[PDB]
Coordinates of all heavy atoms in Angstrom, one line a residue:
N1 N 198.0 202.3 135.4 CA 197.9 201.0 136.1 C 199.1 200.7 136.9 O 199.2 199.7 137.6 CB 197.6 199.8 135.2 CG 196.2 199.4 135.1 OD1 195.8 198.5 135.9 ND2 195.4 199.9 134.2
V2 N 200.1 201.6 136.8 CA 201.5 201.2 137.3 C 202.2 202.4 138.1 O 202.8 202.1 139.2 CB 202.4 200.8 136.1 CG1 203.9 200.7 136.5 CG2 202.0 199.5 135.5
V3 N 202.1 203.6 137.6 CA 202.9 204.7 138.2 C 202.5 205.0 139.6 O 201.3 204.8 140.0 CB 202.7 206.0 137.3 CG1 202.9 207.2 138.1 CG2 203.6 205.9 136.1
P4 N 203.5 205.3 140.5 CA 203.3 205.7 141.9 C 202.1 206.5 142.3 O 201.8 207.5 141.7 CB 204.6 206.4 142.2 CG 205.6 205.9 141.1 CD 204.9 205.1 140.1
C5 N 201.4 205.9 143.3 CA 200.2 206.6 143.9 C 200.4 208.1 144.1 O 199.5 208.9 143.8 CB 200.0 205.9 145.2 SG 198.2 205.8 145.8
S6 N 201.6 208.5 144.6 CA 201.8 209.9 144.8 C 201.9 210.7 143.5 O 201.4 211.8 143.4
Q7 N 202.5 210.0 142.5 CA 202.8 210.7 141.2 C 201.6 210.8 140.3 O 201.7 210.7 139.1 CB 204.0 210.0 140.5 CG 205.3 210.1 141.3 CD 205.7 211.5 141.6 OE1 205.1 212.2 142.4 NE2 206.8 211.9 140.9
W8 N 200.4 210.9 140.8 CA 199.2 210.9 140.1 C 198.6 212.3 139.8 O 198.0 212.6 138.8 CB 198.1 210.1 140.8 CG 198.3 208.7 140.7 CD1 199.3 208.1 140.0 CD2 197.5 207.7 141.2 NE1 199.1 206.7 140.0 CE2 198.0 206.4 140.7 CE3 196.3 207.6 141.9 CZ2 197.4 205.2 141.0 CZ3 195.7 206.4 142.2 CH2 196.3 205.2 141.7
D9 N 198.9 213.3 140.7 CA 198.7 214.7 140.5 C 199.5 215.1 139.3 O 199.0 215.7 138.4 CB 199.1 215.5 141.7 CG 197.9 215.9 142.6 OD1 197.0 215.0 142.9 OD2 197.9 217.1 143.1
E10 N 200.7 214.6 139.2 CA 201.6 214.9 138.1 C 201.2 214.2 136.8 O 201.1 214.9 135.8 CB 203.1 214.5 138.5 CG 204.1 215.1 137.6 CD 205.5 214.8 138.0 OE1 205.8 213.5 138.1 OE2 206.3 215.7 138.2
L11 N 200.9 212.9 136.9 CA 200.5 212.2 135.7 C 199.2 212.7 135.0 O 198.9 212.5 133.9 CB 200.3 210.7 136.0 CG 200.1 209.7 134.9 CD1 201.4 209.7 134.0 CD2 199.9 208.3 135.5
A12 N 198.5 213.6 135.8 CA 197.3 214.2 135.2 C 197.6 215.5 134.5 O 197.0 215.7 133.5 CB 196.2 214.4 136.3
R13 N 198.5 216.3 135.1 CA 199.0 217.5 134.4 C 199.5 217.1 133.0 O 199.1 217.6 132.0 CB 200.1 218.1 135.2 CG 200.4 219.6 134.9 CD 201.4 219.8 133.7 NE 200.8 220.5 132.6 CZ 200.9 221.8 132.4 NH1 201.7 222.5 133.1 NH2 200.3 222.4 131.4
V14 N 200.2 215.9 133.0 CA 200.9 215.4 131.9 C 199.9 214.9 130.8 O 199.8 215.5 129.8 CB 201.9 214.3 132.3 CG1 202.3 213.4 131.2 CG2 203.1 215.0 133.0
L15 N 199.1 213.8 131.2 CA 198.2 213.2 130.3 C 197.2 214.2 129.7 O 196.9 214.1 128.5 CB 197.3 212.2 131.1 CG 197.5 210.7 130.9 CD1 199.0 210.3 130.6 CD2 197.0 209.9 132.1
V16 N 196.6 215.1 130.5 CA 195.7 216.1 130.1 C 196.3 217.1 129.1 O 195.8 217.3 128.0 CB 195.0 216.8 131.3 CG1 194.1 217.9 130.8 CG2 194.2 215.8 132.1
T17 N 197.4 217.6 129.5 CA 198.0 218.7 128.7 C 198.5 218.3 127.3 O 198.5 219.1 126.4 CB 199.1 219.4 129.5 OG1 199.4 220.7 128.9 CG2 200.4 218.5 129.5
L18 N 198.8 217.0 127.2 CA 199.5 216.5 125.9 C 198.5 215.8 125.0 O 198.8 215.6 123.8 CB 200.6 215.6 126.3 CG 201.7 216.1 127.2 CD1 202.6 215.0 127.7 CD2 202.6 217.1 126.5
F19 N 197.3 215.4 125.5 CA 196.3 214.8 124.7 C 195.4 216.0 124.1 O 194.9 215.8 123.0 CB 195.4 213.9 125.6 CG 195.9 212.5 125.6 CD1 197.0 212.1 126.3 CD2 195.2 211.5 124.9 CE1 197.4 210.8 126.3 CE2 195.6 210.1 124.9 CZ 196.8 209.8 125.6
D20 N 195.4 217.1 124.8 CA 194.8 218.3 124.2 C 195.5 218.6 122.9 O 194.9 218.6 121.9 CB 194.9 219.5 125.2 CG 193.9 220.7 124.9 OD1 192.8 220.4 124.3 OD2 194.3 221.8 125.2
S21 N 196.8 218.7 123.0 CA 197.6 219.2 121.9 C 197.6 218.3 120.6 O 197.9 218.7 119.5 CB 199.1 219.4 122.3 OG 199.7 218.3 122.9
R22 N 197.3 217.0 120.8 CA 197.2 216.1 119.7 C 195.7 215.8 119.3 O 195.5 214.9 118.4 CB 197.9 214.8 120.0 CG 199.4 214.8 119.9 CD 199.8 215.0 118.4 NE 201.1 214.4 118.1 CZ 202.3 214.9 118.5 NH1 202.4 216.2 119.0 NH2 203.4 214.2 118.3
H23 N 194.8 216.5 119.9 CA 193.4 216.5 119.5 C 192.7 215.2 120.0 O 191.6 214.9 119.5 CB 193.2 216.7 118.0 CG 193.8 218.0 117.5 ND1 193.5 219.2 118.1 CD2 194.7 218.2 116.6 CE1 194.2 220.1 117.5 NE2 195.0 219.5 116.6
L24 N 193.3 214.5 120.9 CA 192.6 213.2 121.4 C 192.2 213.3 122.9 O 192.0 212.2 123.5 CB 193.6 212.0 121.3 CG 194.2 211.8 119.9 CD1 195.7 212.0 120.0 CD2 193.9 210.4 119.5
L25 N 191.9 214.5 123.4 CA 191.5 214.7 124.8 C 190.3 213.7 125.1 O 190.4 212.9 126.0 CB 191.1 216.1 125.0 CG 190.6 216.4 126.5 CD1 191.6 215.9 127.5 CD2 190.3 217.9 126.7
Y26 N 189.2 213.8 124.4 CA 188.0 213.2 124.8 C 188.0 211.7 124.6 O 187.1 210.9 124.9 CB 186.7 213.8 124.1 CG 186.5 215.2 124.5 CD1 185.9 216.1 123.6 CD2 186.9 215.7 125.8 CE1 185.8 217.5 123.9 CE2 186.9 217.1 126.1 CZ 186.3 218.0 125.1 OH 186.4 219.3 125.4
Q27 N 189.1 211.2 124.0 CA 189.4 209.7 124.0 C 190.0 209.4 125.3 O 189.8 208.3 125.9 CB 190.2 209.3 122.8 CG 189.8 209.9 121.4 CD 188.9 209.0 120.6 OE1 188.6 207.8 120.9 NE2 188.3 209.6 119.6
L28 N 190.8 210.3 125.9 CA 191.5 210.1 127.2 C 190.4 210.3 128.3 O 190.5 209.5 129.2 CB 192.6 211.2 127.4 CG 193.1 211.2 128.8 CD1 194.1 210.1 129.0 CD2 193.7 212.6 129.1
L29 N 189.6 211.3 128.2 CA 188.6 211.5 129.2 C 187.5 210.4 129.3 O 187.2 209.9 130.3 CB 187.9 212.9 129.0 CG 188.9 214.0 129.1 CD1 188.1 215.3 128.9 CD2 189.7 214.0 130.4
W30 N 187.1 210.0 128.1 CA 186.1 208.9 127.9 C 186.6 207.6 128.5 O 185.8 206.8 128.9 CB 185.7 208.8 126.5 CG 184.6 207.8 126.3 CD1 184.8 206.4 126.2 CD2 183.2 208.0 126.2 NE1 183.6 205.8 126.2 CE2 182.6 206.8 126.2 CE3 182.4 209.2 126.3 CZ2 181.2 206.6 126.1 CZ3 181.1 209.0 126.3 CH2 180.5 207.8 126.2
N31 N 187.9 207.3 128.3 CA 188.5 206.1 128.9 C 188.5 206.2 130.4 O 187.8 205.4 131.1 CB 189.9 206.0 128.4 CG 190.0 205.2 127.2 OD1 190.7 204.2 127.1 ND2 189.3 205.6 126.2
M32 N 189.1 207.2 131.0 CA 189.3 207.4 132.4 C 188.0 207.6 133.2 O 187.9 207.3 134.4 CB 190.2 208.7 132.7 CG 191.6 208.6 132.1 SD 192.8 207.8 133.2 CE 192.5 206.1 132.8
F33 N 186.9 208.1 132.5 CA 185.6 208.2 133.1 C 184.9 206.9 133.0 O 184.4 206.4 134.0 CB 184.8 209.3 132.4 CG 185.2 210.7 132.7 CD1 186.5 210.9 133.3 CD2 184.5 211.8 132.3 CE1 186.9 212.2 133.5 CE2 184.9 213.1 132.5 CZ 186.1 213.3 133.1
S34 N 184.9 206.2 131.8 CA 184.2 204.9 131.7 C 184.6 203.9 132.7 O 183.8 203.4 133.4 CB 184.6 204.3 130.3 OG 183.6 204.7 129.3
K35 N 185.9 203.8 132.9 CA 186.5 202.9 134.0 C 186.0 203.2 135.4 O 185.3 202.4 136.1 CB 188.0 202.9 134.0 CG 188.7 201.6 133.8 CD 188.0 200.8 132.7 CE 188.1 199.3 133.0 NZ 186.8 198.5 132.8
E36 N 186.1 204.5 135.8 CA 185.7 205.0 137.1 C 184.2 205.2 137.1 O 183.8 206.2 137.7 CB 186.5 206.2 137.4 CG 187.1 206.3 138.8 CD 186.2 207.0 139.8 OE1 185.3 206.4 140.4 OE2 186.5 208.2 140.1

């Protein structure tokens, strides 16, 4: 809701790659999809 418009390609590499590793990916995907 806050981070720079440009820095969204990066924020996705980040969010996706690190939610995989803690086993909460589809809580992240389900959120980001539900909203959009």
